């Protein structure tokens, strides 16, 4: 066990973030959220990290909200997601590459976490399920904005109406996950796949992150002005420097995140 | 025959909707969109109802727009839209889910009616139209909307510029279906569909619904906020108290739509 | 060669645009983005030009950017896309349809041209590679705009983020392209289309182009009014009154884009 039940470790330029309350298949609690965003904010302010790889412990990703978390007493989701919607603003502007390694079941608001990755790999065995139905509920901690961005409209109402449990190669197919790989192998791949983001131009990354959370709300007149700031803000980077000289010179770049 | 061309039948707790001219392939006029909304009204009103089945009497589910309905005087289509644009805004903000069985030819306002289901199912033998562009118009009741949310950008632009004639198989490929089924066996189908939705949290779909109908237009903010604001209805309702007591038993839930 | 890099030839009602810098891959420079503008102005002018058609030059259709075109200075990306951004805005509001006939190499902002076509073709043999990551800058020429929208967010941020280089066929199966053919074919074929599309209904083809456009932005109260706004425009055409007719009379219509 750890205090807050999120392992972290740095691997050379990459910190890895486990989910650790295996014997609850990682449920979310606030107590957990509170652990993920302060390890977020660590490596996002850590010069020695460039990527970030999320996974889960045990044979789950996470099966989403511990519903013990909660008294008897009539719940206020309003202000338990008004407090904890922090840790998802977190996930979408991080201004470094996010890498999952979705290791086993991931339902509900552990979906809604594996599917904030830049970069999503899926376990052979691993599943997904929308599961806030089943128990009454809508979607949250964002799965209502990513879905049908992700999967489109039509795969989106299917999915949350319904609740079906969807394999890695179903997730795959429907572009919830990037890349499926056997389970033994799937850390393996995780890595060298975070260790070639924490070698790229890590401002690029975040800019580009901050240019399609905001793409579909956008006229293509604010998008263009967005992408003409950002692209300003791009081309002033010792990177991009870097990366027309690596260009001229016919090889490859070396990238420092600045 | 039936004043107002709306067939309508409750079996269970399924409202079953039959556009109902089939002589004319139940072209739509303001007549027959009174007698919908009044219909979708209805259904929405009715304790006894939790799902509602739209589909079409004859050979088509709907050719879309009858022509007769307009003179020989230069059209104006702007009033007769923004007279008759509330019914979309009945079927979209629909606070029970709403399956659509596609029983033959959709296309025009047929096609964009048939895709406001929230499920959808074609018959084999059934085809999608978008149709406008070949009487020199453009998308409306809401296909401008729809369709590139369902299939994306891509496919939408070459739906609606070239009006491509779709079988079932091609729009099940493209998302504007869930499923194909035996004509002989769309209706059994498509209302045993209906009737597990008539089971289900009710007001879970409505919300959901909500969401989803949202979800591009919000950023990430908005969106969290509006999870939160809906998460908290939801967690009042008794299917919700219902839906944790019966995961934590391991049985089905009873739901009730409240 | 030729000043400005555009060369221009009308076939019939068609427009035929081809960059021209075969000798830099077509790189993108602000004096081609001026000929282009003003070849895109000329034809949308043009009464006697129904639909335009962009192709490329030599063995690419754009490796985008000349990077020459900036001194050894700090450069100032917001101020350039600032200045050409209405390029790009010209694009995307055409009046007049535009089919793209991908060549060959279509590479960061000569991806983001060649996705500016309604209708878009390519060679065996072309390819899409979004680059921008591999010199440390963003999407920019509203690639952050037009790739989530015909590939969906997954396929985006793989593409965008990875900048894996596309054969034809793997852009077809994403709808980066409608359509692949021999390299020897591709201008035949995508003259046909054009020249097809030269002889459609221009102005449903303009308002439809706008729906699209905005269609993600918009609530769907706003999209409704919308569509009636605008079909309300296509109705009061002439080619609307002679689409009536052919319709009755089940014979082609003959449209004149007015």
């Given at each position: 066990?750890?205090?807050?039940?999120?392992?972290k470790?740095?691997?050379?330029?990459?910190?890895?973030?486990?989910?650790?309350?295996?014997?609850?298949?990682?449920?979310?609690?606030?107590?957990?959220?509170?652990?993920?965003?302060?390890?977020?904010?660590?490596?996002?302010?850590?010069?020695?990290?460039?990527?970030?790889?999320?996974?889960?412990?045990?044979?789950?990703?996470?099966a989403?909200?511990?519903?013990?978390?909660?008294?008897?007493r009539?719940?206020?989701y309003?202000?338990?997601?008004?407090?904890?919607?922090?840790?998802?603003?977190?996930?979408?502007?991080?201004?470094?590459?996010?890498?999952?390694?979705?290791?086993?079941?991931?339902?509900?608001?552990?979906?809604?976490?594996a599917?904030?990755?830049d970069?999503?790999?899926?376990?052979?065995?691993?599943?997904?399920?929308?599961?806030?139905?089943?128990?009454?509920?809508?979607?949250?901690?964002?799965?209502?904005?990513?879905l049908?961005?992700?999967?489109?409209?039509?795969?989106?109402?299917?999915?949350?109406?319904?609740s079906?449990?969807?394999?890695?190669?179903?997730?795959?197919?429907?572009?919830?996950?990037?890349?499926?790989?056997?389970?033994?192998?799937?850390?393996?791949?995780?890595?060298?796949?975070?260790?070639?983001?924490?070698?790229?131009?890590?401002?690029?990354?975040?800019?580009?992150k901050?240019?399609?959370?905001?793409?579909?709300?956008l006229?293509?007149?604010?998008?263009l002005?967005?992408?003409?700031?950002?692209?300003?803000?791009?081309?002033?980077?010792?990177?991009?420097?870097?990366?027309?000289?690596?260009?001229?010179?016919?090889?490859?770049?070396?990238?420092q995140?600045?």
């Amino acid at each position: 066990s750890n205090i807050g039940m999120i392992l972290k470790e740095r691997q050379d330029g990459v910190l890895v973030l486990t989910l650790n309350r295996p014997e609850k298949l990682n449920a979310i609690t606030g107590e957990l959220l509170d652990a993920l965003y302060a390890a977020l904010k660590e490596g996002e302010e850590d010069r020695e990290v460039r990527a970030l790889l999320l996974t889960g412990a045990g044979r789950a990703f996470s099966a989403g909200q511990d519903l013990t978390e909660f008294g008897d007493r009539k719940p206020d989701y309003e202000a338990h997601l008004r407090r904890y919607n922090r840790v998802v603003e977190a996930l979408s502007g991080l201004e470094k590459p996010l890498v999952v390694a979705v290791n086993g079941v991931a339902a509900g608001a552990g979906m809604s976490l594996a599917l904030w990755g830049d970069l999503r790999l899926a376990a052979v065995g691993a599943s997904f399920t929308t599961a806030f139905v089943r128990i009454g509920l809508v979607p949250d901690s964002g799965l209502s904005f990513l879905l049908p961005r992700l999967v489109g409209l039509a795969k989106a109402q299917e999915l949350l109406l319904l609740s079906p449990r969807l394999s890695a190669e179903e997730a795959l197919a429907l572009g919830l996950v990037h890349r499926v790989v056997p389970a033994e192998k799937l850390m393996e791949e995780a890595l060298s796949l975070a260790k070639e983001l924490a070698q790229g131009p890590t401002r690029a990354y975040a800019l580009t992150k901050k240019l399609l959370l905001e793409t579909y709300r956008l006229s293509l007149t604010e998008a263009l002005a967005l992408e003409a700031v950002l692209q300003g803000q791009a081309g002033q980077t010792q990177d991009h420097e870097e990366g027309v000289r690596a260009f001229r010179e016919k090889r490859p770049p070396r990238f420092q995140g600045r």
